Design a protein around this ligand. Sequence first.
Ligand code: VO4
Length: 282
Amino acid sequence: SPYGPEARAELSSRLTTLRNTLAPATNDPRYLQACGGEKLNRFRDIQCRRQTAVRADLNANYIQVGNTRTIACQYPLQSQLESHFRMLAENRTPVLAVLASSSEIANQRFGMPDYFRQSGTYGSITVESKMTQQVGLGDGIMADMYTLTIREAGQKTISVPVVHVTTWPDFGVPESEVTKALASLVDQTAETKRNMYESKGSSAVADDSKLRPVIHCRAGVGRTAQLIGAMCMNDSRNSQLSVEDMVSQMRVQRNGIMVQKDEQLDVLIKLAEGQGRPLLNS
Ligand code: VO4
């Protein structure tokens, strides 16, 4: 009943209305607009809510789901890499979770620069990538981890832990289990790094706009929203937050596409069912 087909149909009805109406119109004042013709959105229809935008030249949003604070973004365009690295450093990013598969990144047709597995120079910023551990998430899925060290003359040097999920599981219980293991790994990695900053007395600890996990896949709305939803269910502070709440919050704070596919919503429903967490608001 509470997780039966009637409730799931009602959830989908509410979310569909929200999506359709959050759809961007041309020059929509709700969404960040490209500057003077320079491409901003990787996908024309997948835009960036202006009032929560992190930087004026990235497709990237501050998201707070219940009490859980993150950044969700698209895979940066080649032209955006310097700005993307500056975002990562200024945020004191405690974990960067890349959910785009290795095969996608490799496909040059997709224009996804291999920016966290190779060292490089991007304008004024230099980046060193060192591969660290490899963590199995179940069902043959592997998380390759890295430390990204971001240097820029005059700026504090910042190292960012990276969790890269190299392939994605098949729908069903395997994907719900991998998602749970991924959220645990991303949360754990962020807590370890945030603790380091706290032990140093970093002022970043007092700034709720900083120390946010950064999550992206290709467009930052599918696997990215699924992971964010899974992470907010791991947060002890989010008791009674409904699936309707968390998806509505991701959509108002990034775009109407957050949780793009029925199968991604079904993962969230299954995780919520496992907790006795409500699907709908009463
Ligand atoms: O690269 V994603 O917004 O399709 O899961």
